[PDB]
Paper text:
Here we report on the structural and biochemical characterization of PET46 (RLI42440.1), an archaeal promiscuous feruloyl esterase exhibiting degradation activity on semi-crystalline PET powder comparable to IsPETase and LCC (wildtypes), and higher activity on bis-, and mono-(2-hydroxyethyl) terephthalate (BHET and MHET). The enzyme, found by a sequence-based metagenome search, is derived from a non-cultivated, deep-sea Candidatus Bathyarchaeota archaeon. Biochemical characterization demonstrated that PET46 is a promiscuous, heat-adapted hydrolase. It shares the core alpha/beta-hydrolase fold with bacterial PETases, but contains a unique lid common in feruloyl esterases, which is involved in substrate binding.
The best PET46 crystal grew in space group P 61 2 2 and diffracted to a resolution of 1.71 Å. The active site is composed of the catalytic triad Asp206, His238, and Ser115, as inferred from structure homology to other α/β-hydrolases. A phosphate ion and two ethylene glycol molecules were present near the active site, likely coming from the protein buffer, crystallization solution, and cryoprotectant. The bacterial and the archaeal enzymes present the typical residues of Ser-hydrolases at the catalytically active positions (Ser, His and Asp), but PET46 lacks a Trp associated with PET binding and formation of the aromatic clamp in the IsPETase and LCC. Nevertheless, the lack of an equivalent to Trp185 in IsPETase or Trp190 in LCC suggests that PET46 adopts a distinct substrate-binding pattern, probably involving the lid domain in the formation of the aromatic clamp. The largest difference is the medium-sized lid comprising 45 aa in PET46 (Leu141-Val186). Further structural differences around the active site are found in the enlarged loop between β4 and α3 (Loop 1; Asp68-Glu78; deep blue in Fig. 2a), which folds back to the outside, and the shorter loop between β10 and α10 containing the catalytic His (Loop 2; Arg234-Arg242; magenta in Fig. 2a). Note that the lid of PET46 has potentially adopted a non-optimal conformation/orientation for substrate binding.
Numbering used by the authors: 1 to 269
The structure:
């Protein structure tokens, strides 16, 4: 079952989509995953990657919530006002939403994030005791403010300082709040607070987010939980465009989740 949902965050509506397993009995409760999209992404994500990921997770027995951050997709708000802390607010609200569903096991909720959404996932997991596992795809874990500004002309940076929304490419505009707070929390600085299982998947041909950041992240957390894993997708680009890479990412994610024993369909009988 797939159905649209809405909830409020920071005074504004978020629209999302909820995947519910069809074999979920009346009293039964399922583990759940909230999925966080990337920068200038939406809840379907590139070449519908999140749709495919969510369908596979739901087939595996998870309730899955995908939603548009405020300022993205069909949620309220303007993109130029978006900030990473604002997306952490939204992300926490999506956990609230899953926690209040009577067919979700409130003690078996985890998160999945792609790139900037992986940044959000890591930040939220460093704080939120409700998160029981973290899945990071192509995650942006390192400082980004300087790299973002280095892509802008000096006169554009001044206009940003003066309060203008400036063009950042492909028709997307951004105000300074994003640049001021994208490094308020840098994930590498708080990764050692995450003690639940973390799966890091990163392509060795990612031209957007260097693999180096995923390697550093794994180095920090590898012995904090003996289920933590780093999977490097050989030939994989930032959003796993080649079909075989998308399949590999999904297969590795399902396999890893199996190791955590979150679903027990045999016992469900
Ligand atoms: Cl905000």
């Amino acid at each position: 079952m797939i159905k649209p949902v809405t909830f409020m965050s920071e005074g504004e509506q978020i629209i999302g989509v909820l995947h519910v397993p069809d074999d979920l009995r009346g009293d039964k409760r399922a583990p759940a995953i909230a999925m966080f999209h990337g920068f200038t992404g939406n809840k379907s994500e590139a070449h519908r990657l999140f749709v495919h990921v969510a369908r596979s997770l739901c087939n595996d027995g998870f309730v899955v919530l995908r939603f548009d951050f405020r300022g993205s997709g069909d949620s309220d708000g303007e993109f130029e006002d978006m900030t990473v802390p604002g997306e952490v607010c939204d992300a926490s609200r999506s956990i609230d939403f899953l926690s209040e569903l009577n067919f979700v096991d409130s003690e078996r909720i985890g998160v999945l994030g792609l790139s900037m959404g992986g940044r959000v996932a890591a930040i939220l997991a460093s704080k939120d005791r409700r998160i029981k596992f973290v899945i990071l795809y192509s995650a942006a874990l390192t400082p980004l403010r300087r790299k973002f500004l280095e892509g802008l002309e000096k006169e554009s940076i001044r206009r940003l300082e003066m309060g203008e929304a400036v063009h950042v490419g492909n028709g997307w505009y951004l105000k300074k709040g994003f640049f001021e707070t994208v490094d308020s929390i840098v994930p590498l600085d708080v990764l050692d607070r995450i003690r639940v299982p973390v799966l890091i998947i990163h392509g060795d041909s990612d031209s957007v987010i260097p693999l180096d950041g995923a390697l550093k992240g794994y180095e920090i957390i590898r012995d904090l939980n003996d289920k933590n894993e780093l999977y490097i997708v050989r030939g994989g680009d930032h959003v796993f465009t080649r079909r075989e890479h998308t399949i590999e990412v999904i297969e590795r994610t399902l396999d890893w989740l199996r190791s955590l024993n979150l679903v027990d369909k045999l016992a469900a009988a």
